[PDB]
Scaffold this active site. Structure first.
Site, PDB file in Angstrom:
ATOM      1  N   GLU A  91      39.968  39.320  22.021  1.00  0.00           N
ATOM      2  CA  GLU A  91      41.066  38.582  22.652  1.00  0.00           C
ATOM      3  C   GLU A  91      40.675  37.207  23.185  1.00  0.00           C
ATOM      4  O   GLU A  91      41.510  36.483  23.711  1.00  0.00           O
ATOM      5  CB  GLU A  91      41.655  39.326  23.880  1.00  0.00           C
ATOM      6  CG  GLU A  91      41.977  40.821  23.709  1.00  0.00           C
ATOM      7  CD  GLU A  91      42.705  41.356  24.923  1.00  0.00           C
ATOM      8  OE1 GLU A  91      42.840  40.731  25.970  1.00  0.00           O
ATOM      9  OE2 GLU A  91      43.183  42.549  24.726  1.00  0.00           O
ATOM     10  N   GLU A 143      41.153  36.692  19.209  1.00  0.00           N
ATOM     11  CA  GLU A 143      42.003  37.364  18.237  1.00  0.00           C
ATOM     12  C   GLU A 143      42.578  38.661  18.760  1.00  0.00           C
ATOM     13  O   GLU A 143      42.202  39.171  19.802  1.00  0.00           O
ATOM     14  CB  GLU A 143      41.235  37.648  16.928  1.00  0.00           C
ATOM     15  CG  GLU A 143      39.820  38.220  17.165  1.00  0.00           C
ATOM     16  CD  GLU A 143      39.839  39.563  17.855  1.00  0.00           C
ATOM     17  OE1 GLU A 143      40.469  40.522  17.457  1.00  0.00           O
ATOM     18  OE2 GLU A 143      39.126  39.593  18.947  1.00  0.00           O
TER      19      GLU A 143
END
Lengths: 346, 346
Positions: free
Chosen positions: B314, B171
Site C-alpha cells: 500500500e 499498490e
C-alpha cells in the site's frame, strides 16, 4: 538505591494480550506490519503508559563529561570540544538538537563532569572536572557512581511527572569510545581488538594504541563483569554512568527509553547487568557504524530499526527513531477493523 | 513516450558538490552522520529540488488493480478485498493512510484496473476489469502498457506543478506478489523458487503451486528481459505498470520517489531497465519481509534504511520513511558550523 532497583515494575501481560488481539483485528493481513506490531505490544505492557501504546511528551537527555584517558592519545577531537558542544546544545545548533526539533522532542543537557567552567543553561550534576584516566586506575569511586545513578534516575522519573512518556538517551565526551569499548569487552568477554573502533575519525594508524589502552585499563582495574556498578566505576565514565541512570530511572517509572549508538549500548549492558528488569523498557534506534556495535547488540539481543551508518552520538539516532514509536501508536489507534469491512481471512 | 524518456534530466553535479562541502563544514565529525549525509547530497542533485535538499508537499500514489492469476489459487485474500480496501483508502482507515497522515503526506488512490464497479473518490484510470491471467497468456497488450505508463507519468509530473516535491509509490491488488515474483525472476535471472514468497499469509503448503504458476507464466509468455515494457505487459499487471509510471514521471520531473516493498522493487527493476536515467531518483524505504526482497534489492544496488519486517504494501513503508528524508534536509539546513565555534579538526 536498592529500593529503586527493587521497585522496577514488570511489564503488564494483561495489557499486552489486549493489545495483541486489537492489532490482529486491524485492516491488514495479520502480522503484516511486523516490527511495528511488536513495538506496539511492547509499549502496551509499560505501566507508565496506561495500558495502551501512546506517546505524550518526548525528551532527549544528553550526558556530558570529560575523560582522563583523553591524555593517552586515543582521540583526535580536542578536549575542549566537550564544553563547546555542550554550550552549542543550549543554542539548538547541534545534530541532536536539529533532529529532536524535527521529532518535536526537547533536549535536556546534563553536565555530569565536564572539565571546564560551568556552562550556563546546562543542568548541573557535575561529579568532577573529568573522570580519572582509566589507563592507570579507576574512573571514579563506587560511591560516586552510585550517587550519580541515584541522582539521574530521580531526575528522569521527575520528568515523567511532567508529561514526558518517551525518553531518548545520548552523550557528549571526547574520548568516550574508549571506556565504552572497555566495558563492552568486559561484559561480553570479547577481545579488545574486536570492539575497538575509530570513534570520531581516529586515524587507522592510531588504532593499535587505542587497543593497548583498553587492555591496560582492564588489566590494571580488574573490573568484575558480574558487577555492573563495579565495571562502570572502574572502566566507565560519568557520562556512561549518567546514561545508565536514565535507563534505570525510566524503567522504575515504567516508561520506554530509546537507545542511541555504541556508547549507549555500553550503558545498556551495564544497566541490564545491574537490573535485568530494565530490559523490557529498552528500545533500540539505529545500528551504529562503530566496530563493536554488532557484538554489543548481540549481547543485548537487540535488532535496531534504522540502518544509517551513523556515528555522531549525542542522542541523534534516538531522536531519529522517535517518529517510529509514534507510528506504532498511530497504527494502533487509527486504523480501521477487518470486521467493519466484512473482511474475513482464513 | 520516447520524448518522455528522452527528457529525463541528469543529476546536477555542481549542486551536489556544493552540498557536500556544506555538509562537511557542519558541527560534527566529517561523515559522522553517514547515510543521512549521502541522502542529502543525493537530493541536492535532483533538478526539481532547486539545488538544495528540500521537501515541500508529499504524496503517496497507490495503484490499484485486480489480476487474472488470482484464479490459479495463488492468494488467500478474497478478490473483492481490492475493491473494499480501495474504498477504505478514501476514508483514511488503511495502513498507508494512517502512516501518511503521521508524515503529513496526502494519499492519492488510483484505479488502474480494479475488477468491480467504479469507486467514487478514486482517481479513475482503469485499463480493464482486472488484467489477463499471466499463467496462460499476457497480462495485457504492449499498447495498453505504454498508454498507462504515459498517463500515470503525466499525472505524476502534474502534481509537481502543485508543490509536491516528494513522492511515495504503493499498490493494492490481491495476488500481485505472483506477477512481482515473475518479473523479478526474469530481470535478475533468478530461479522462481528463490523469489517466490508467502505474500499475504499464503499457507506454506500452497507455495509449490505458486512457484509452478510463476514458471508457467514465464514459459508461456517468453518475456524479453532486455525489454522492460515487454516484461511488464506479459508477466506484470496494471498496478505494476502504474508504479513504474510514477517512477518515470518523477524522474522526468527531476523529483525523488520513495520505494515501498517487494512489489515496488519489481516495478523499479522495470523502470531502470526501461530508462537507467531513472535510478538516481529512487530512494529505498524499508527492507520487505518478502522472500525475494534481497535479490531484487541487490540488483537495484540498494540498501534500505528501515528494518521493520513489513509486508503490508500500500505504500506504507514509503510513508514511514518520509520523516527520514525530512531529517536529512533539516540537518542540512539547520545545523551550525564548525568554523563558527572555532572548532578545528585535523
Amino acid at each position: 538505591l536498592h529500593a529503586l532497583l527493587r521497585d522496577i515494575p514488570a511489564p503488564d501481560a494483561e495489557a499486552m494480550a489486549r493489545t495483541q488481539q486489537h492489532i490482529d483485528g486491524l485492516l491488514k493481513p495479520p502480522g503484516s506490519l511486523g516490527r511495528l506490531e511488536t513495538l506496539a505490544v511492547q509499549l502496551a505492557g509499560m505501566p507508565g503508559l496506561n495500558g495502551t501504546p501512546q506517546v505524550g511528551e518526548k525528551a532527549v537527555l544528553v550526558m556530558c563529561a570529560d575523560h582522563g584517558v583523553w591524555d593517552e592519545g586515543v582521540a583526535v577531537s580536542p578536549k575542549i570540544v566537550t564544553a563547546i558542544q555542550a554550550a552549542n546544545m543550549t543554542r539548538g545548533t547541534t545534530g541532536v538538537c536539529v533532529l529532536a526539533a524535527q521529532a518535536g522532542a526537547k533536549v535536556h543537557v546534563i553536565d555530569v563532569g565536564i572539565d571546564a567552567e560551568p556552562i550556563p543553561g546546562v543542568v548541573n550534576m557535575r561529579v568532577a572536572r573529568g573522570c580519572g584516566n582509566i589507563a592507570v586506575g579507576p574512573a571514579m569511586s563506587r560511591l560516586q557512581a552510585e550517587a550519580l545513578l541515584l541522582e539521574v534516575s530521580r531526575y528522569t522519573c521527575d520528568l515523567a511527572q511532567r508529561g514526558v512518556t518517551l525518553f531518548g538517551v545520548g552523550e557528549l565526551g571526547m574520548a568516550n569510545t574508549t571506556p565504552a569499548a572497555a566495558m563492552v569487552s568486559v561484559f561480553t568477554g570479547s577481545d579488545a581488538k574486536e570492539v575497538v573502533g575509530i570513534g570520531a575519525n581516529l586515524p587507522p594508524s592510531r588504532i593499535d594504541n587505542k587497543v593497548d589502552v583498553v587492555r591496560r585499563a582492564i588489566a590494571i582495574n580488574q573490573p568484575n563483569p558480574r558487577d555492573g556498578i563495579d565495571v562502570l566505576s572502574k572502566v566507565g565514565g560519568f557520562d556512561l554512568v549518567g546514561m545508565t541512570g536514565v535507563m534505570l530511572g525510566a524503567a522504575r517509572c515504567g516508561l520506554p527509553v530509546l537507545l542511541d549508538g555504541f556508547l549507549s549500548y555500553s550503558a545498556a549492558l551495564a544497566a541490564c547487568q545491574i537490573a535485568p528488569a530494565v530490559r523490557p523498557y529498552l528500545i533500540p534506534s539505529h545500528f551504529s557504524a562503530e566496530k563493536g556495535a554488532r557484538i554489543a547488540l548481540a549481547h543485548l539481543s537487540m535488532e535496531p530499526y534504522l540502518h544509517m551508518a551513523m556515528r555522531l552520538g549525542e542522542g541523534s539516532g534516538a531522536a531519529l527513531a522517535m517518529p517510529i514509536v509514534e507510528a506504532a501508536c498511530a497504527m494502533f489507534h487509527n486504523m480501521g477493523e477487518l470486521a467493519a469491512s466484512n473482511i474475513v481471512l482464513p
